[PDB]
Design a protein around this ligand. Sequence first.
Ligand SMILES: *[C@@H]1O[C@H](CO)[C@@H](O)[C@H](O)[C@H]1NC(C)=O
Ligand SMILES: *[C@@H]1O[C@H](CO)[C@@H](O)[C@H](O)[C@H]1NC(C)=O
Ligand SMILES: *[C@@H]1O[C@H](CO)[C@@H](O)[C@H](O)[C@H]1NC(C)=O
Lengths: 228, 230, 224
Amino acid sequence: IRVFAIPPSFASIFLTKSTKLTCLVTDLTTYDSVTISWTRQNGEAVKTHTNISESHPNATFSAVGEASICEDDWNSGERFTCTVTHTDLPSPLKQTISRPKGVALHRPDVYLLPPAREQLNLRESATITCLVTGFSPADVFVQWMQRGQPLSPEKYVTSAPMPEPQAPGRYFAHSILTVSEEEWNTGETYTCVVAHEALPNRVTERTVDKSTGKPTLYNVSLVMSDTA
Amino acid sequence: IRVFAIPPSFASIFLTKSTKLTCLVTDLTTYDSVTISWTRQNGEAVKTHTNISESHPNATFSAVGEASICEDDWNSGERFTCTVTHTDLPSPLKQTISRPKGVALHRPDVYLLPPAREQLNLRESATITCLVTGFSPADVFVQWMQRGQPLSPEKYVTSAPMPEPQAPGRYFAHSILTVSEEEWNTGETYTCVVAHEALPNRVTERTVDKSTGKPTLYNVSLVMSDTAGT
Amino acid sequence: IRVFAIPPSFASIFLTKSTKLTCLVTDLTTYDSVTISWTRQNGEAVKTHTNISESHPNATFSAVGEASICEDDWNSGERFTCTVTHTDLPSPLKQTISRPKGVALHRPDVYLLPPAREQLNLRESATITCLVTGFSPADVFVQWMQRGQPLSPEKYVTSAPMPEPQAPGRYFAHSILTVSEEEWNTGETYTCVVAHEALPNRVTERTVDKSTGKPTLYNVSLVM
Ligand SMILES: *[C@@H]1O[C@H](CO)[C@@H](O)[C@H](O)[C@H]1NC(C)=O
Ligand SMILES: *[C@@H]1O[C@H](CO)[C@@H](O)[C@H](O)[C@H]1NC(C)=O
Ligand SMILES: *[C@@H]1O[C@H](CO)[C@@H](O)[C@H](O)[C@H]1NC(C)=O
């Protein structure tokens, strides 16, 4: 009986714009009369459940049980407890869901680095990296937009957060968006959206352009002489 | 009896980090045992209703009650009804406020405008404006932060939304942050934050500084008289 | 009751080069004995109000009043009282129309702002705004002129005056001009004029174009 109730990630919270709690049974024979429900503080019980599949190649009952509940309820510590009433165990399988309060809350520092000059000289592609550093919960979401329109998820790839060597509490992550080199030369502005809990507005946007790392000063001095 | 309530705009709920709506009753006699609550169409009212204001000396109430309500439930289209029971009106008075449905949801087109040279040449101050235009509906919230830190609301003021001349459906707004010239000389982010429901992430951030724009300056210092005609 | 006595703002007197007094009749019987006051302190009667409004659908009667009063006489501070002799009230309602005096006059500091780089990069429309700062009181009739010919009122929108955050006495105003990007690229010597009483000539002009907004870039030096 593997009731792995993994809380949805913050990227999943701002991806589908809905908080779906997870209480899924793994490695168990599919049976009937399973009355799953969520019990919280003050005895509230609101639930809608779908995605029930009788047959599985691994002989594991799905019992996905995804319900839409407001984010403020999670922010209030409602301790969402799953109550899977399986036949073998008459007592409901209690699995609580709550945010691990007590962790450090450091806002990320978003830096939109310009593409390398040699790669643009190669005239093949233009990969703009979005270096996100300094976040303790390590729950970061990176999304790219062009002219205010979000791009397809397959154009940009985001690496999983990993601990920072200098700061043990803080974490860092990176993501790259690959476009054509003349697309970069066109003058389009790319915005990197970084979603995190510690941010005052929960998101942060940085804009990159052709004129973000150009040489502000040219100091050419043409000196010509006819003597040794 | 002028019955009216102020619906919680997106700007207010974005500023307060919570969704709360007020029930307001005007031109009624001063009786005790006030029972006002926002009843959802399923028949379940608000949990708590506190912070009721005190009557004006002119025998007119502007009392407002606040409660914690889910934002998804409000903006999904579910209308909220306020029940008003009092000795003056034995029949239960009802109120209704709800955001309009079917209105065009177009993202704002934010273009921050750097200040002109002459305001910098004058030594009094510098004004940085964040031109927000082409957004529907009219409601919008503009916030200014410096280096990721929120600034005081007294420094920046947001203009009231007005329709765009080209398109009647869209609207445009202004927000000016007045800062000293020496602050503009130093490198500061001075981020402009625009909040709107039609945006995907609901927040648009733009940055500006002294090095913003700044076409490349050339310093050609050529020496040619050393040849002296071979 | 209530009467919509709207004093003529500085914009109205600036546009028509004359003062057009307005005292809108509201909340009165449509076809009852009505006597609106249109006399000065001395009692002289102005010319009869023109363009009388028709019968409003509700019980309230509507009427548009106009008058031709001078500039300094209207600035002299005499009282233009609006009172109506009507049978629905035993006593007539008085709402005097007069300029409020004692307000400080501050010279506006207008500074036109070039269009943003992102707007010039996306290239859908070009919005040129004329920022008005440090003007008091809250009155403005800022305009927009194209190559010497003023643009249509519909093209430009003038924002309502609001108190300045740093200076409570002073106010600010906005006036955007939505134009084509190619028009800005070609250069149409757009100009902005702002109307205010505190200026020595009541209006000042600022000129902008594409070459404006571009500093000196080419510091080529010839030395011997
Ligand atoms: C540019 O070059 C000149 C000499 O050619 C030098 O004196 C000057 O310091 C240089 N500019 C900067 C910013 O260093
Ligand atoms: C431009 O060149 C002149 C002549 O060499 C020099 O004196 C000046 O400092 C330069 N300006 C810069 C480098 O900003
Ligand atoms: C331009 O060049 C002259 C050459 O003498 C120099 O004095 C001046 O400082 C330069 N200005 C800039 C902004 O580089």
